[PDB]
Amino acid sequence: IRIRLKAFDHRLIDQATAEIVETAKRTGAQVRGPIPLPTRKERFTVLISPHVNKDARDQYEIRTHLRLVDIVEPTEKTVDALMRLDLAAGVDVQISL
Amino acid sequence: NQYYGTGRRKSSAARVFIKPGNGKIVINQRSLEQYFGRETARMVVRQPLELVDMVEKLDLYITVKGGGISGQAGAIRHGITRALMEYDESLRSELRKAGFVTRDARQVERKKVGLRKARRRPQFSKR
Amino acid sequence: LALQAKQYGDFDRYVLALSWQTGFCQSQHDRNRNERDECRLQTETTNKADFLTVFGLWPGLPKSVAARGVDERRWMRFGCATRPIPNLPEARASRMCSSPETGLSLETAAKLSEVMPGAGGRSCLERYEYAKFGACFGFDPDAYFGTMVRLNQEIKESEAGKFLADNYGKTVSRRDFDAAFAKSWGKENVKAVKLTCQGNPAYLTEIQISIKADAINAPLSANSFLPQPHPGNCGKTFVIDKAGY
Amino acid sequence: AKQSMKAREVKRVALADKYFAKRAELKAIISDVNASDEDRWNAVLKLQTLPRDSSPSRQRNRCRQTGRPHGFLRKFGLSRIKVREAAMRGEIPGLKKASW
Amino acid sequence: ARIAGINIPDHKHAVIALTSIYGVGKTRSKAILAAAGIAEDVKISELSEGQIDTLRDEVAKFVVEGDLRREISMSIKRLMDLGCYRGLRHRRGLPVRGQRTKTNARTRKGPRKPIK
Amino acid sequence: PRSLKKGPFIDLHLLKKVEKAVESGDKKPLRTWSRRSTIFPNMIGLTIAVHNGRQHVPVFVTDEMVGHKLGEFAPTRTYRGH
RNA sequence: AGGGCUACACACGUGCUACAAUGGCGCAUACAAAGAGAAGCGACCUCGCGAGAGCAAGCGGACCUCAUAAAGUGCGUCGUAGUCCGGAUUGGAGUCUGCAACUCGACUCCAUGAAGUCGGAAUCGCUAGUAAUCGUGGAUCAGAAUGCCACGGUGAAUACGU
Ligand SMILES: [Ca+2]
Ligand SMILES: [Mg+2]
Ligand SMILES: [Mg+2]
Ligand SMILES: [Mg+2]
Ligand SMILES: [Mg+2]
Ligand SMILES: [Mg+2]
Ligand SMILES: [Mg+2]
Ligand SMILES: [Mg+2]
Ligand SMILES: [Mg+2]
Ligand SMILES: [Mg+2]
Ligand SMILES: [Mg+2]
Ligand SMILES: [Mg+2]
Ligand SMILES: [Mg+2]
Ligand SMILES: [Mg+2]
Ligand SMILES: [Mg+2]
């Protein structure tokens, strides 16, 4: 089983990882290493004056962070627990068999 | 017992392995004279060897990914000068005096708002 | 059981699909899409009609869903996974045997594996198909898959089925398919047919027949067809592909 | 934006996604080379009949706060102005000033 | 080196030379010198009367020179006599295909007419 | 121009009211805002006064006017010179 | 609903493409970065000279798709011509988006082949991976960049001095 973790904060994500790679160890299973992935950086430019003045801008950004964790030898026990976990708000997870 | 460097210039990265031998070179499963058309490139790649006359006393092996020609060519030179002063912690001082040991750093400047390029700014004629 | 519609049931027509297995297998080669173990076999037969298989059966686009800004093209392409509604879990064609098991009685699930060759094992075309169109509506799996087979055999038996059996390996024409088909059902319900050909020269790969919604359970007849103005890309002639390459 | 102008966008959305299928299939025959000249010719007359405001190309993305027709951003559904205003409060998760 | 009742350069590669014919561009030039299986790099001066004729033949397949010039002129007369928007653009001597005139448009209008 | 496969475009309203012109022979001019519509052969012989923005202007249709679009005969700007 | 903001004796500003041989054309062949995609990015196959069309894998993506970088390089040709330079203008024939491209779209093929031979007085940018020059992406967006915002390739000149 693979779970991909994704979020806007980096401290926040490096929690959920540690949380999951604690349970996986708990409910007897081998977890194949939290491996980080390229972080997408959507960028935006906007006129900051409400009229005229083209050369006056802000440059905004959203950094998305991706993490991947595997499940080597999925115990029957684990599959329920790693499914049943209330996980920090503002974090998307995608467990997929 | 093969000696290794990484080497970077602009956007290039060059991982290199040297071994004692008669003076062969491979870049990305290819020969020097093939991979690099431009003459400059060649000069640059071998000038660390040409310095410490091991031009034909060691046999080199390389791969490069990223950058253009003068980038890769440059990145390789740095790669060698790293390995070549690791096989021999001795040579450093000589290598260094030629200014091969430093990693260039010069990158392309970003484009900025209000400008046509990094620093070129649109005309306005007082004419 | 009878095939009836629970949640959602407001559509004009089922649309039965049929893969000319030889012609289907052929494309796979031409395009170089991987050798699936279904075609890897492709052993010959005595009757040259058992190549006419069921690829699927597909309910119409139910008015309710259509009223939320959904059109046939999307409907077909996603089915129950369509948004905003119905929006059920996604039936991947790339990871087939990951979709839920259907619950199929081996009475049907043998009958099916005679007319849907790559069903079960490491193929699960059954599973995927149920997700894509069955699930949403709330059908009886043993009935639904059942109702397919019923209709498949009916067509092999008809004048239509015979024509392919006859002109196997040979080039043909729509006209002589048109006759063939009509002689069973009528010169009223020809347009309900739509063909699909591939390659050069054209060889038939797929056949689709657009059956009225009320008449799905009760056997076929001159009043069990809904003609639609799309005849398909096949053109004036086409090969009835023989097995091989 | 004038209340009226905000409104038209609702009239226009509603129709667009009610006749959505009718248009699609009624278009589908038009572009079918291999179809009845009788059919397709009918269609051309039939599409032009059902109402203009029911076309998706007829609508205009307006900030869903102030109604502005210009300087829209899809990611937020807001004008450049309201995007900035909200950005600075921290009402847009993640978003923040950038340098490189 | 007389084709379509005009003199063709005889020191030019056939490809280039044949273009002097009004109504043949470069695509046609290539075709001609293959439909009439004549090489491209061959200069016109080093040919046979025979070669020049089979060539003369190919060119007759098209509508060219005089003929063409007439066709065009009919088409434009046709428009102006119809009086369509496109017609008047041709009369008043203005960009016929939607181009701006507030500025530029000097190829139709010709060089500048000052004020006063 | 419009793809060839999609056929020639005419607004229906106007298409209809040049059956009654051609069947039930009249001899009046017709009002129309249908500058889109291309001129069909049926339209040969009938004056039809197409809108230019403020006024309708008569276009006595002919053989030569076939395929073109009405509005291609109702100029919409006034210019004498400077 | 239709038209107008796209009007054109003219004046000014900001750009693009040129005027050629450090170049045009044909064949052959190297080396990037950054970014976008959900009912969206759309391969492979078939059709078409081409814009494209049909069919339909994969991908909510370090995996699939956009999407083959170009200048460069080798071999050939043109031989200093208003030219094999330039590509404006216009006729003919198409494609696609869209209820709909007459006024007023982008693109394609065939033909056409203008001004321009390096620009008076004035006047602007830039001190290093900068200027110069070459390609790539994105936002807006049904369709409609030579603009804007980003990304790499090649890569100078000269500062005595006040
Ligand atoms: Ca075969
Ligand atoms: Mg991405
Ligand atoms: Mg500016
Ligand atoms: Mg640059
Ligand atoms: Mg108000
Ligand atoms: Mg719009
Ligand atoms: Mg041309
Ligand atoms: Mg209006
Ligand atoms: Mg304006
Ligand atoms: Mg320039
Ligand atoms: Mg040229
Ligand atoms: Mg885009
Ligand atoms: Mg082709
Ligand atoms: Mg400075
Ligand atoms: Mg550029």
Contact E84 F64 (CB under 8 A): no
In one-letter notation, the amino acid at residue C74 is: R
Question: Å from C192 (CA) to G157 (C1')?
Answer: 77
Which of A93, A82, A66, A87 has its CA nearest to residue A25? A82
Contact F75 E86 (CB under 8 A): no
Residue of B nearest to A45 (CA): B113
Domain ranges of chain B: 1-127
What is the C-alpha to C-alpha distance for residues B57 and B21, in angstroms, rounded to an integer?
5
Domain ranges of chain D: 1-90
Which of E14, E10, E32 has its CA nearest to residue E23? E32
Question: Å from A44 (CA) to G34 (C1')?
Answer: 15
CB F5 within 8 A of CB F36: no
Residues 6+ apart with CB under 8 A from C83: none
What is the distance in angstroms between the Cα of F82 and the nearest Cα belonging to chain D? Answer: 37
Q: Look at the alpha carbons of C34, C38, C42, C43 in this order and tell me if their dihedral is positive or negative.
A: positive
Q: Which residues on neighbouring strands pair with residue C14, listed in sequence order?
A: C211
Q: How far is the CA of A13 from the centre of ligand 1 (A)?
A: 54
Chain A residue numbers touching B113 (CB-CB < 8 A): 45, 55, 57, 59
| Burial state string for C154-164 with b = 16 or more CB within 10 A and e = fewer than 16 | ebbebebbebb
Q: Which helix (H) or strand (E) holds C146?
A: helix C141-157
- Nearest 10 degrees: CA dihedral of F65, F69, F73, F74? 160
**Partner D contacted by F6 (CB < 8 A):** yes
**Partner D contacted by A58 (CB < 8 A):** yes
**Partner B contacted by A58 (CB < 8 A):** no
Q: What is the resolution of this structure in A?
A: 2.7
What is the C-alpha to C-alpha distance for residues E62 and B119, in angstroms, rounded to an integer?
56
* Token pair listed for E92: 């008043």
Chain E residue numbers touching F72 (CB-CB < 8 A): 84-86
* Token pair listed for C135: 């699930």
Chain D residue numbers touching C67 (CB-CB < 8 A): 18
What is the C-alpha to C-alpha distance for residues E29 and E16, in angstroms, rounded to an integer?
8
> Which residues span the domain enclosing E25?
2-65
Which ligand sits closest to the CA of C39? 1
Chain G: nucleotides below 7 Å from protein CB are 1-15, 30-37, 39, 43-47, 53-62, 69-74, 77-79, 84, 88-92, 94-106, 109-114, 121-133, 139-143, 148-155
> Which residues span the domain enclosing F24?
2-82
| Burial state string for F30-52 with b = 16 or more CB within 10 A and e = fewer than 16 | bebbbbebbbbeebeebebbbbb
- The total number of structural domains in chain F stands at 1
Domains of chain A in sequence order: 1-97 (3.30.70.600)
Experimental technique for the deposited model: cryo-EM
| CATH number assigned to the domain comprising residue E10 | 1.10.8.50
Residues 6+ apart with CB under 8 A from F5: D31, D33
Question: Å from B73 (CA) to G74 (C1')?
Answer: 20
Mutation target for A interface from B113, B115, B121, B124: give the one with most A CBs within 10 A.
Answer: B113
Contact F72 E88 (CB under 8 A): no
Residue where the block lists tokens 């059109």: C71
